[PDB]
Design a binder for this molecule. Structure first.
Ligand code: AKG
Ligand code: MN
Ligand code: ZN
Length: 302
């Protein structure tokens, strides 16, 4: 399913150990949560839960008990610290090992302009609007002033003709996705204000880059970062960041310094896109609705 990119080898025969997909700490599943469910099938000799991973490893005393878990727990639902439902998927593993990845680069074509606006400029926009969502496109002069500067500065190359307002509350976010190709051009920028947050960007092949969007920052995503990748916001109330560069934006790597968590706040976003007139024709037909419009096969795959 995903374990492929994760470097986890699975076998088709019963074994004492098995990987538990979606049963990891990085998914919101606690040891006090999973361990009980696991023991319900046998004597759990070990529950290995690697940090920041959407999975954990379980090992039973006998290979028979393990098979019981594989056939009874597979598909079982559990509630994370986010008060959400998540199904578990177990698989037999001969050995317990996985790959650790630490992206050093933002998805190509993505860039976060820090302190794009001032404090008063932030306060203003916030008190001039009134999961909460709001569409446009049209564009209120309230920002026609800013956009103009955006272009001159060079941060943006095209003036948008549509804008969406998103207001997220501590806990709520938005599931991963990719803005429609045939709907907007190759340039979608997003101004985050009120309270910093962490946007997740994922590549189909497997790469996972958790980008931290600070307040008063303009996330501009173009190219691959806007056509192939996928942006989302894990619904949580606490984001983990690096001690020093906590307020700074970028990739939140680990093992390079002491780590500390931060509480979320009422974040409001202003996404700007230019509605496309022609049909999209990028280099990513795997996700481009326009380029795969007339393909019975793709159609079947919905
Ligand atoms: O939260 C953001 O800044 C991204 C906006 C977004 O995902 C959308 O509404 O299409
Ligand atoms: Mn979006
Ligand atoms: Zn496309």
């Amino acid at each position: 399913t995903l374990l492929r990119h994760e470097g986890i080898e699975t076998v088709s025969y019963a074994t004492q150990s098995l990987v538990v997909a979606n049963g990891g700490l990085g998914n919101g599943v606690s040891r006090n949560q999973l361990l009980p469910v696991l023991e319900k099938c046998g004597l759990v000799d070990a529950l290995l839960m690697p940090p920041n991973k959407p999975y954990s490893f379980a090992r039973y005393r006998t290979t028979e008990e393990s098979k019981r878990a594989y056939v009874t727990l597979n598909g079982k639902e559990v509630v994370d610290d986010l008060g959400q439902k998540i199904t578990l998927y177990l698989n037999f593993v001969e050995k317990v090992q996985w790959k650790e990845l630490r992206p050093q680069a933002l998805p190509p074509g993505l860039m976060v302009v820090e302190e794009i606006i001032s404090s008063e400029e932030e306060k203003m926009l916030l008190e001039s609007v009134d999961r909460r969502v709001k569409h446009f496109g049209g564009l209120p002069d309230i920002c026609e002033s800013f956009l103009e500067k955006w272009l001159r500065k060079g941060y943006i190359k095209h003036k948008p003709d549509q804008m969406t307002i998103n207001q997220y509350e501590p806990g709520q976010g938005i599931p991963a996705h990719i803005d429609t190709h045939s709907a907007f051009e190759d340039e979608i920028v997003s101004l985050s204000l009120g309270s910093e947050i962490v946007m997740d960007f994922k590549h189909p092949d497997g790469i996972a880059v958790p980008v931290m969007l600070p307040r008063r920052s303009l996330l501009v995503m173009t190219g691959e970062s806007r056509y192939l990748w996928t942006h989302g916001i894990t619904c949580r109330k606490f984001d983990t960041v690096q001690a020093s560069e906590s307020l700074k934006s970028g990739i939140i790597t680990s093992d390079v310094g002491d780590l500390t968590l931060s509480k979320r706040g009422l974040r409001t976003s202003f996404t700007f896109r230019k509605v496309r007139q022609t049909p999209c024709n990028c280099s990513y037909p795997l996700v481009c609705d326009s380029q795969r419009k007339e393909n019975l096969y793709f159609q079947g795959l919905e």
